[PDB]
């Protein structure tokens, strides 16, 4: 009868807000604006967010709350034929923890590297430097900046690895950092929601404090207005381009993370009659809103670099890890009270990651706990058994060629896997389970049915939206490359197994569960398309 519930409502919101808001809100969204026409970019971004983005986000939250179970069991009880979706999502989440947690390790490595009167990455005269070192970022590949060479030749030691075939030694300063991250994750997640629910109070909130003072510090710098100009100055010639819409579509989907099994897990500890429609609208908004603020943070400082430091905006305006571990720390080193801004920046970067790691792990734990009561009472031992597996294989990212391994998983593990998974999630919930059947479930919870708007999106828009992203993801596909290095064919094939191992669960479970039931062909489908609620 009983299932554990959130203590207080805020904990749930902070957990969702936390999982949702991460480094991609910082090192991706602002860049996309800059590249896509600035203020103009908000139109396709907004529409995509409205039609495909929020509906999927809303959907999984409602499902999580209604069915009251983790990913595996919930999709089993919804469309038994499609129960495979549960396994696909849990595996993906499993693969992702292997790499993503290392970003937090880097944040902590820099944090620990940040207590000095003079930051190590400011000059070119150190031992890890090369004769080609520059004070700041340029447009030539052979000549890097001071901050770039610090990250590459010192922190990473990536220069000593000839590719993925050669990982080299193990940096045990990085191993230490990765352990500390998993230690924190353990002591956060081992007691369940009662703890993890209140830990996210700090980790979800802290970033906004630091965003606040970095925003002021940024806008009070010379040339900060020039940054904002590059960031938001509207160009609508981009709007006609399909590539922009794809960029908006893709960003919205991967920033919100709908159908990732995390939202499902969190909402499953919700009280049945809780209003999840408000929770979805507020939570989504806060995510995009956070990205918007962060753009100001970044580009104010990026403008100051182009003004006082004499670097071309093109060169310093970047996405991904490069932005936060090189470009931004570079500007910080120049301004007064540098040691202060560096310390809170890398701490923000860490707490930005932590929120999301909890969710990912939680999706896995909750999913398994429900399907296997065997591990449900043993949870304190289980996540230890989990994070241990994480840490062990995670050591591959702490080697000198560890980035090559990291970059491999980043492209393959969750990229095309979760898209097809969520695509079936949409088709399951709407075409199979039915919208009217679904809408009825929601009315029982929050008292009123979903508007015809939400019902249209879940049915026609969602699949086309997902399909739209998937198609252009395949169209523009290129073999895996990092910098001047080109991954071997056997490396790509390895990733495709990782990409395919999750997705294959969908048909596998269907075919298997189909042969394991009695009756006709059409008689078996009705058995596997009958919800668990209808059988009572």
């Amino acid at each position: 009868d009983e299932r554990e519930t959130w203590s207080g409502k805020v904990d749930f919101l902070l957990s969702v807000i936390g999982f949702a808001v991460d480094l991609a809100n910082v090192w991706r969204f602002p860049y996309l604006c800059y590249k896509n026409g600035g203020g103009a970019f908000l139109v396709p971004y907004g529409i995509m967010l409205a039609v495909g983005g929020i509906p999927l986000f809303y959907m999984e939250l409602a499902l999580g709350q209604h069915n009251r179970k983790g990913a595996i069991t919930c999709w089993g009880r919804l469309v038994p034929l499609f129960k495979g979706i549960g396994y696909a999502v849990v595996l993906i989440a499993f693969y992702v923890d292997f790499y993503y947690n290392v970003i937090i390790a880097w944040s902590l490595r820099f944090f620990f590297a940040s207590f000095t009167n003079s930051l190590p990455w400011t000059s070119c005269n150190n031992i890890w430097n090369t004769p080609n070192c520059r004070p700041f970022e340029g447009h030539v590949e052979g000549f890097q900046s001071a901050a770039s060479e610090y990250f590459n030749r010192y922190i990473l030691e990536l220069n000593r690895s000839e590719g993925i075939h050669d990982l080299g030694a193990i940096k045990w300063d990085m191993a230490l950092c990765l352990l500390i991250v998993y230690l924190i994750c353990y002591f956060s997640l081992w007691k369940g929601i009662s703890t993890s629910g209140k830990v996210v109070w700090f980790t979800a909130l802290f970033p906004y404090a630091v965003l606040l003072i970095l925003l002021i510090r940024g806008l009070t710098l010379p040339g900060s207005f020039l940054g904002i100009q590059y960031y938001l100055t509207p160009n609508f010639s981009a709007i006609y381009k399909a590539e922009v819409w794809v960029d908006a579509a893709t960003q919205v989907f991967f920033s919100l993370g709908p159908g990732f099994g995390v939202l499902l897990a969190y909402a499953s500890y919700n009280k049945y009659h809780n209003n999840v429609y408000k929770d979805a609208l507020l939570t989504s908004f806060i995510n995009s809103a956070t990205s918007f603020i962060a753009g100001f943070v970044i580009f104010s400082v990026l403008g100051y670099m182009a003004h006082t430091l004499g670097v071309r905006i093109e060169d310093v305006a970047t996405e991904g890890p490069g932005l936060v571990f090189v470009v931004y720390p570079a500007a910080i080193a120049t301004m007064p009270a540098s040691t202060f801004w560096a310390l809170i920046f890398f701490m923000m970067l860490a707490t930005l990651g932590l929120d999301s790691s909890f969710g990912g792990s939680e999706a896995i734990i909750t999913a398994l706990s429900d399907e296997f009561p065997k591990i449900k009472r043993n949870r304190e031992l289980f996540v230890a058994g989990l994070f241990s597996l994480y840490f062990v294989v995670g050591l591959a990212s702490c080697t000198q060629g560890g980035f090559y391994f990291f970059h491999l998983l980043d492209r393959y593990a969750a990229g095309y896997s979760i898209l097809v998974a969520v695509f079936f999630e949409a088709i399951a919930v709407s075409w199979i389970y039915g919208t009217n059947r679904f809408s009825e479930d929601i009315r029982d919870m929050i008292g009123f049915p979903p508007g015809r708007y939400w019902q249209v999106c879940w049915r026609f828009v969602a699949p086309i939206f997902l399909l739209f992203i998937t198609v252009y993801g395949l169209i523009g596909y290129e073999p895996l490359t990092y910098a001047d290095y080109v991954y071997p064919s056997w490396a790509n094939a390895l990733g495709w197994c990782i990409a395919g191992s999750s997705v294959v669960m969908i048909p596998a479970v269907a075919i298997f569960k189909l042969l394991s039931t009695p009756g006709s062909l059409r008689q078996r489908f009705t058995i596997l398309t009958t919800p668990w609620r209808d059988q009572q």
Partner: antibody
Amino acid sequence: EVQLVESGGGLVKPGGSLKLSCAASGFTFSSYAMSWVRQSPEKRLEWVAEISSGGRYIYYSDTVTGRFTISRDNARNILHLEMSSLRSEDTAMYYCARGEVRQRGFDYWGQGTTLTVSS
Amino acid sequence: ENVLTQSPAIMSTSPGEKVTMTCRASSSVGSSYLHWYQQKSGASPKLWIYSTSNLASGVPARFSGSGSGTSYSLTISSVEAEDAATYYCQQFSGYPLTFGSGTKLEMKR
């Protein structure tokens, strides 16, 4: 536009059984949860049972629970209340009332049909 | 079970006058779950106010409603003869669903 007509009902001896029906027209019956509300001859309103749009969620008042069964046919657009083990307290004007939204209440009512339980 | 009591039981009002009637619940009710019904004699009930401030279709502007928690009220600014009826408050907050005891409105003469 939308109309609701309660039918069946009349005199029944205590302990007996009777099936009340409601003919829905003028809207999409399938998309709306219905409810039976009765009014005693002392003119007191009492909610009886609610059935979902697809009838997959049923709620009863503790007074009729286990005796009354609420039911739907979305093909013929008819609401049913089948009663058993009728007591005298069951005597009332039985109303067929629509609403799908708890926040808006019951926006439409039938003319009502009268049930008398006496020996 | 959440019982809604209404007072007055009966009230007489001279046309043009202002009438206020109250509905109080044993347990708190969400302000958006409280509704009012007007039932004219020999007729079936009609939805009047829902969410406690919101008039239904055809309901003249002379009608208003307010309240929160366990306390709500229906007010008529300037009463008319076509306003004479019994008024029922209803709680949709939780099951079982309950109706108020009702307030019968009559005209002074």
